[PDB]
Every structure is written in structure tokens, then in C-alpha cells.
């Protein structure tokens, strides 16, 4: 009973710490907001910053088709916003992410697109929970309409089942990824997302430097 009292105490302790993780993570997220704005403003005076930074990332290239880079090269702003800052009802891991594309005159439309990702809870299989999104509208390259899902004739065709697949594997297919339709969506959409929120956006500068360290050589 002096022995059981203690197990309970520790269990309450273990949970104080959970609470402190979030409280710290928020603290950090707020200190970083201004600094990201300053930084992002400077990023913006470098005009091929994201082009460079995205061709040099090892994993990122793996998530998307070679063909996609035509369009990835037209990305010129990326802003991540941590939604837990806007409201205490989001996981500190929640964020929205906004891309601006310069488009390719006559093929790809210049556009700004935001996608949000929030953790959803499970029934004991959570592991913190899982990341999910909803489809956000983006306008596909005119080339890609051969594999644009909104623009395809029939999934069942043998041709038709192959194009929809190839299209869902593009960066654009990722834009309608939700994480709630297994084996029907862009592969590892959640991993690419976290990649942006945890690796690419927070350290893009470091990657741009490494990219230049690698061009000189």
C-alpha cells in the first residue's frame, strides 16, 4: 500500500511529463514564429532557393516521379504554419502548409495551394495517433491530364487503371491524399508531409548551404 501508492504516483508523474512535452513544444513553436518570418523574408530574396533545396533532398526525390520536377522547379514559396499556435485544440504536430508555384506559361498554372494535416486519434492503435488531411484543390499541368484523375475517362480500362495510378503517385496526387483510404492514395503521403514539417521547412537553409558546398566540389 506504500508500494502501490508509489506506482500511482509515478503514473501521475509520467503524465505530468506528457503535459510538459506539449507545453515546451508550444513554447518553442512560438519563439520560432517570428524567426521563421524573418528568415522566410530573406529566403524570398533568393529566387531559386526552393528549386535548389528540393533537387538536393535525397528522400524527397524518392516520393515523387522524375517527371514532377518540371513543376517542383516552379515552387518559390513554402510556408508551414503550426496550427496548435492558432488553437489549443490541435496537436502540436498539426500544421498547414502553403506552396506557391510560378507555373509554366502554357502548361502549368501559377497558383497558391494550402493543405492541412492534423493528427487523428485511434482506438489503442494510435501511437500518438496518425496524420490525416483532406483533398485540397490544385490545377494539374496540361500535360498531366492524360493522368489527371478529375480528367480521366475510366479507371477500369487496363489503360485506365494504369494512368490513375501514375497520377496518384505524382506530387499532385499527394494533394488529394487524406490518409484515410489505404492503398488508394499517394504512397506515404504522411511521410512526405512530416518530411516538410520536420525536415525540409525547418532546415531548408542548411540544405541550401550543403547544396552549394556540393556544387563547388
Amino acid at each position: 500500500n506504500e508500494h502501490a501508492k508509489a506506482f500511482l504516483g509515478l503514473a501521475k508523474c509520467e503524465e505530468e511529463v506528457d503535459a510538459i512535452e506539449r507545453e515546451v513544444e508550444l513554447y518553442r513553436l512560438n519563439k520560432m514564429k517570428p524567426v521563421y518570418e524573418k528568415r522566410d523574408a530573406y529566403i524570398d530574396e533568393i529566387a531559386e532557393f526552393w528549386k535548389i533545396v528540393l533537387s538536393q533532398h535525397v528522400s524527397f526525390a524518392n516520393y515523387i516521379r522524375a517527371s514532377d520536377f518540371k513543376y517542383i522547379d516552379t515552387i518559390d514559396k513554402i510556408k508551414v504554419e503550426w496550427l496548435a499556435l492558432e488553437s489549443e485544440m490541435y496537436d502540436t504536430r498539426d500544421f498547414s502548409i502553403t506552396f506557391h508555384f510560378h507555373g509554366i506559361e502554357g502548361d502549368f498554372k501559377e497558383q497558391q495551394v494550402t493543405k492541412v494535416f492534423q493528427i487523428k486519434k485511434g482506438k489503442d492503435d494510435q501511437e500518438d495517433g496518425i496524420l490525416t488531411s483532406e483533398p485540397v484543390p490544385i490545377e494539374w499541368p496540361q500535360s498531366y491530364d492524360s493522368i489527371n484523375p478529375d480528367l480521366i475517362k475510366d479507371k477500369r480500362s487496363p489503360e485506365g487503371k494504369k494512368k490513375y495510378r501514375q497520377g496518384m503517385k505524382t506530387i499532385f496526387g499527394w494533394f488529394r491524399w487524406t490518409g484515410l483510404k489505404p492503398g488508394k492514395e499517394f504512397p506515404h503521403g504522411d511521410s512526405l508531409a512530416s518530411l516538410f514539417s520536420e525536415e525540409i521547412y525547418p532546415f531548408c537553409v542548411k540544405y541550401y548551404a550543403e547544396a552549394q558546398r556540393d556544387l563547388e566540389d
Partner: protein, 432 residues
């Protein structure tokens, strides 16, 4: 099963070691685990596995307070519902550290440990099997399992104490629980047996920095391949039926070269190629077995990453595997495979003298790491390994490191030693 056995691991080893010389051995085994299928399945395929059982065997020998040899073998028993059953011995690695002062035949040691593993009744692994997933949703009261958070674990401990005065459930040891928490299967003793092996000098790392040690002779891809070939060769001769499939292949090398190496084999039916099937039009994904630390699997996982799984055939796969610097192979690395039936029906269920089975994966790893995580640039690591092994066994397992005396020599003998030991059996068993 529960009946006597005559051949033991102690026996196999002594037979192959120098007469009147002491050696300690460590034979370590994992708790047999229900696991994913060996070869990536085909969404629409001939036959689907009722179950796949994985067990690791790790061996080490020591002479005079120093480890000097190790062998890592995984055994896989695959059960089909309709299509019978087969066992596959994947030989992961065999290495030395070059700190054995007296001369021994490592080729023969390695051969004989594999014969021992061949002599093991498959059913031995099927008796009590850790499931891949245990469902605790059916069991009352609440258990503390792999998925319990520390806070829930502690609250359960607390509830148990207030109610019981103990944190142990007597219920775990009861018949109802033990049968629901493990799996059991059966199969024939005489089943198709495969052996798999990938020679690559870069795999030879059971003893980190043992290269630095002048005493160890490091083999090159070619020497290393031959070393193994001799051993597989002998297994075929001594252990398999003479209709057994024997394959060798050296990726990026042309078969006429390969064929020139098979020249030496005593065993008649060595062939260039491999023991893998030709499913989904020779697509590599569906024919390549994925083993631990094995180069084959590593590449497959890179394919998966570059979504090229549907774009590489088996033919293509060997050449690409050789082309990519990240997998090595450079010094003529090779792939050997055996498929067939052993001469003898494997009857043996290893005894406490044949194997030590640590209580969990963590404990198994802890012991093995005393050897594989030691540094061997100098002799002091071969001592550290032995000391930590002997000490850990006694301290946590109340076990002493097993000893044995070799009994083999340059045979000038009056009669063949196999026909000599049999006489001794006849007299002691038939007690005249």
C-alpha cells in the same frame, strides 16, 4: 520428440576438433517466432502460407579464454495449407577473429554445425511459437503486454497489489492461458530443405576490427566463395540425396567463368544459376527471399523506395545488384543455394546441452552483442568476449559455459573411425 537421442551438438563438434584439446562453445537460440513470409507474396498466387516460423541459431567457439569463431544461421519453417511444408536454412555469416593459437579446421567446424542444424526435427520449432500478434482483448483480467503504456502498466501493478498483495497473476501459468498465448503446428520430419548463402567479403564482420589484427587472414571474394563452396559441396555429399539441386552464381560474371569454378566440386550436380522460382514473369520482387542483413533484401528495399519493384526482373536484378556500389560485391561476390531432401529423417529435438534459449529477444541480443559488439583490433577483445559470456551466463542464467574435448587426428587408424565408434555402441547398447 520425448524419446532418447544419440547424436548431440557436443558430439558433432568434438568429432571435428583436435584430439585432446579443450574448447568451450556457445549455442544460442531464439524463441521461434511467427513472422512474415520469406518471399514477398503474389497478391494472386498459386498457394498462400498457413504460417511462417523463424528461429535464429548463433554459435561461438572459445579456446583458452578467448572467443575465435562465430556462425549466424536463421532457420525458417514454412507451412502451407495444401502444399505440404519446407525448411530453409539461411546461413547469414561465419567469421573468425584470428585469435586461436592452435590450428583447427574452421571449414569442418562450420560444416559440422550445419549438419547438426540439418539433423534437427522441424517440429522442434513448432511446439510453442511466439505469435506475431497476441490478442489480449479476449483475456480477463488485464494483462501487462508489449503495448501497455508505462502509466497503464503502473496502474495495473497498483490495482493488483491492492487486491492481491502481489503483482503476479497465477493465471498466466494456467493451462487456458498457455494454449491461447502460443501457437503450435505439426508437419512431416522429412521435408524439402533449402540452404541459402551470400558470400561477400564486406559481410564478414562478426568480429569488428579483426582486420586490424595481423594474425587474421582476411579472404577476398574469390577465396571466400571457394571456402564456402567446399563446405556446401561436402554437405551435399554427406547429407543430401544425389538428386539435390545445387546452384552457384556470381552476379555480373558470365556463366562460363562461374562454370569454371564448379569444376572443383566433388558433388556432381552443381549448376550455374540459383534455386529461386520463376513467378510473375521472373519479376525479382516475387522470387527473391528477404533475409536479415542480406544484400538481396537490401536492394529489394531500395527498389521498393524507387518504386521500381515492377521494373526489375531476376536476370536484371543480379546485374543491377553488382552495379550499385552501395551493396559492394566488388570482389567477385556470389550466391549459393541448395534444394532437396536429406538422407536421414531429422529426428532430433535439441536438449539443454545443445542450446540455450534466453528468456526474451532482449536477453538473446544482450548475450550475442557481447561477442559481435566487442572490438578485436587487439587480443584483449577476444578475452573480453569470453569473460563477459562466461560471466553473464553464470550470473543471469545460472549456467556455466559448456566444455568439450576434441577427438580427431590424422587417421592412421586400424579401422574407419565411423565403424569404430559404432562397435563401442554395439557393446554398450547390446551389453554382451
Amino acid at each position: 520428440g520425448m524419446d532418447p537421442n544419440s547424436m548431440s551438438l557436443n558430439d558433432f563438434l568434438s568429432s571435428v576438433l583436435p584430439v585432446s584439446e579443450q574448447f568451450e562453445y556457445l549455442s544460442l537460440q531464439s524463441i521461434p517466432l511467427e513472422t512474415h513470409a520469406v518471399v514477398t507474396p503474389n497478391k494472386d498466387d498459386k498457394r498462400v502460407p498457413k504460417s511462417t516460423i523463424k528461429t535464429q541459431h548463433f554459435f561461438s567457439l572459445f579456446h583458452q579464454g578467448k572467443v575465435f569463431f562465430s556462425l549466424e544461421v536463421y532457420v525458417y519453417v514454412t507451412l502451407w495449407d495444401e502444399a505440404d511444408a519446407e525448411r530453409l536454412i539461411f546461413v547469414s555469416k561465419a567469421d573468425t577473429n584470428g585469435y586461436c593459437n592452435t590450428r583447427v579446421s574452421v571449414r569442418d567446424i562450420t560444416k559440422i554445425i550445419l549438419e547438426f542444424i540439418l539433423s534437427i526435427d522441424p517440429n522442434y520449432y513448432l511446439q510453442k511459437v511466439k505469435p506475431a500478434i497476441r490478442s489480449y482483448k479476449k483475456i480477463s483480467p488485464e494483462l501487462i503486454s508489449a503495448a501497455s503504456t508505462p502509466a497503464r502498466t503502473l496502474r495495473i501493478l497498483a490495482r493488483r497489489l491492492k487486491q492481491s498483495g502481489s503483482t503476479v497473476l497465477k493465471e498466466i501459468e494456467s493451462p487456458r492461458f498457455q494454449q491461447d498465448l502460443y501457437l503450435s503446428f505439426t508437419c512431416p520430419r522429412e521435408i524439402l530443405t533449402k540452404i541459402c548463402l551470400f558470400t561477400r567479403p564486406a559481410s564478414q564482420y562478426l568480429f569488428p576490427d579483426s582486420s586490424k589484427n595481423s594474425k587474421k587472414h582476411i579472404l577476398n571474394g574469390e577465396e571466400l566463395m571457394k571456402w564456402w563452396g567446399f563446405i556446401l559441396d561436402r554437405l551435399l555429399i554427406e547429407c543430401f540425396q544425389n538428386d539435390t539441386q545445387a546452384k552457384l552464381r556470381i552476379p555480373g560474371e558470365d556463366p562460363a567463368r562461374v562454370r569454371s569454378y564448379l569444376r572443383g566440386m566433388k558433388y556432381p550436380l552443381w549448376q550455374v544459376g540459383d534455386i529461386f522460382t520463376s513467378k510473375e514473369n521472373s519479376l525479382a520482387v516475387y522470387n527473391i527471399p528477404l533475409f536479415p542483413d542480406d544484400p538481396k533484401a537490401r536492394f529489394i528495399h531500395q527498389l521498393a523506395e524507387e518504386d521500381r519493384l515492377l521494373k526489375v526482373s531476376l536476370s536484371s536484378f543480379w546485374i543491377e545488384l553488382q552495379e550499385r556500389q552501395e551493396f559492394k560485391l566488388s570482389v567477385t561476390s556470389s550466391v549459393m543455394g541448395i534444394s532437396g531432401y536429406s538422407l536421414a529423417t531429422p529426428s532430433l529435438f535439441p536438449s539443454s546441452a545443445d542450446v540455450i534459449v534466453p528468456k526474451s529477444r532482449k536477453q538473446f541480443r544482450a548475450i550475442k552483442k557481447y561477442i559481435t559488439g566487442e572490438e578485436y583490433d587487439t587480443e584483449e577483445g577476444a578475452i573480453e568476449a569470453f569473460t563477459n559470456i562466461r560471466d553473464f551466463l553464470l550470473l543471469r542464467m545460472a549456467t556455466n559455459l559448456q566444455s568439450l574435448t576434441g577427438k580427431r587426428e590424422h587417421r592412421e587408424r586400424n579401422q574407419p573411425v565411423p565403424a569404430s565408434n559404432i562397435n563401442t555402441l554395439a557393446i554398450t547398447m547390446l551389453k554382451p
